[PDB]
Design a protein around this ligand. Sequence first.
Ligand SMILES: Nc1ncnc2c1ncn2[C@@H]1O[C@H](COP(=O)(O)OP(=O)(O)O)[C@@H](O)[C@H]1O
Ligand SMILES: [Mg+2]
Length: 710
Amino acid sequence: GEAAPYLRKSEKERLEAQTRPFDLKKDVFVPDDKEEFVKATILSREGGKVTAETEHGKTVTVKEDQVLQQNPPKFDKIEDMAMLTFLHEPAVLYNLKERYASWMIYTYSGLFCVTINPYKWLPVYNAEVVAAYRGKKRSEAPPHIFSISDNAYQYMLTDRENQSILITGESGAGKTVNTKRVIQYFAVIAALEDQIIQANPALEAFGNAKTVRNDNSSRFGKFIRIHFGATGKLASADIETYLLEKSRVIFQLKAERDYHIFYQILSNKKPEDMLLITNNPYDYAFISQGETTVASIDDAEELMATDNAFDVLGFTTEEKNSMYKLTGAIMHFGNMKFKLKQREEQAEPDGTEEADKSAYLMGLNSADLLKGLCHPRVKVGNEYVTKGQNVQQVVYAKGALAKAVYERMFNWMVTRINATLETKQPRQYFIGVLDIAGFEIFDFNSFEQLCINFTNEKLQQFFNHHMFVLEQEEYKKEGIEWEFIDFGMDLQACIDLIEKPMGIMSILEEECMFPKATDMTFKAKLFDNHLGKSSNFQKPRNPEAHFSLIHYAGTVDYNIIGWLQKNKDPLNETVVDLYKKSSLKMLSSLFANYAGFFQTVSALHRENLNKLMTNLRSTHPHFVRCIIPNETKSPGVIDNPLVMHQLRCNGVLEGIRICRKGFPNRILYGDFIDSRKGAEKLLGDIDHNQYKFGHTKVFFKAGLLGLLEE
Ligand SMILES: Nc1ncnc2c1ncn2[C@@H]1O[C@H](COP(=O)(O)OP(=O)(O)O)[C@@H](O)[C@H]1O
Ligand SMILES: [Mg+2]
């Protein structure tokens, strides 16, 4: 057989009808003062178009020049949108809807792939499918992330250059689950190295958690590069982490959860007591707020999934019991007294079981830590002063240790993981796979949310910078003297407002170095600098005292609390000095090592990202746009304003234009005197018209080289 008999591949891609209602019936998509349209039979035409509608009445002349019509049902449910005769928001949504209701999540849009989250597990990712997709053309194979990932792999071999697959989506849009299959494809294409497959579910327990927008929400940016040699066999794999929401460990909002790991460990009877663990909620204060479990997910069976990944990847039984002794101690640090010696402002713990956290966490003196937290030694100039803190500052310092201990342990995981995957025989060509923490909007948005929205903005900029601006620069002289066409999409203004002089980051860094500086001080400084000046900055009126920032994906209001403390994440030297001199070997490396763990958090993320974007530019990009159908995390429901504006901000429609208007195919006088003339040498039975050049020939349309190969 092949991909032609009606079984599994043909079953899960399109379906035939038996009634053909076609004829000369022409239609138009019409709304009702909102972005929600219905079909309408066109009744009359001259200067405008009289449309019947019949849905709640009839005739309405007002169509004219705007109009924007319905495409023949012949196109309805097509695979590539650059094929549609009429192109606009309703015409595009309907084709994506027609496919979705037939459980076809993938659709092509000019070049870049489009994926609408199903919120149900579709059987389209099988070994039988990976094999059915091995080395097959875009025209030869229907839309699928296995085709896009194959095309990238083929291009890194045919063009001999680095490739990068870039996935673009909001929180819960399918980025992680797509990234998961791109790596799943290559291990059973070019490749033991099963571990590459096991690295992601090991960074899922410690790295992913439950938000109101996603149950397995990636609380970190991930750059996974799959290494290849000369022939194209799997040489290695390198992973990089980004803005980890380490504040989630000490605090979670209503209905949310902490990292999966905490819930998984309490569920497993490994000490069967030694770690002094008990029940998931109640007892542990860093967990007992909102919820304990996620629907249709087993916290007992998930630690069986991660212990499997640790033992596969080379983590020994002692290393495991070390990592869990940390997790069990973060939970143990979570229950402190911090009462009062003198009822004014002197903190004092009235005998607690912190001698048990001190037991699990590398046998640190129980008499110490108590002193290292309550009374930590500072210095005024050259004088070693002893500070006697208050209940609030003791809580924040306790938290400082929890967040520090955790992030540093998570960063160690990646170092230990890469000292398995990356370490083999690396060099040559490679496939980069981006899985960034998607565009977030909540009731309370703090520092980490701004960090996220900056990453999402700059990644979206890279899509605008590559689809248009870069393409149009090449068209300048060589093309049809290129008009040129102008697209309203420009996210540099909102970027400049966040970073470069003058920007939010710079204004914030200046306040960390400043001693008198407080939260109330620098929100005033922000307003002083950006209100009534920048149009993409907004100062809430008499809402609150926070600040609003306009993005491609919409405006966000960010609350200022912590922020200065978040940016200059401080851990008292006494608590650092306390942990270096400890029993357990694992946390000894978490404080004694310097090569791996002053620089302000915002400047580090700014530069981590700078570094990331500079890698990508030296790579050939492949875009995947993840569209979320709804906000109730439910299958079968595709909402009109939710989807119709993800495409509006993603620049999906304009990305079909220039792919249609301009010249997507560029070449010289090779790969075909033997070859020099674009008109003369190619004139020898069909076409001979849709192209253009001046010098450094030729610039052809997408619908010419597709037939030249076929
Ligand atoms: N292609 C897909 N097939 C099946 N389920 C999917 C798919 N994409 C996403 N999901 C579901 O939606 C959830 C949210 O997607 P996810 O990849 O975790 O988010 P994000 O895009 O933010 O990284 C997943 O936990 C999974 O249940
Ligand atoms: Mg994710």
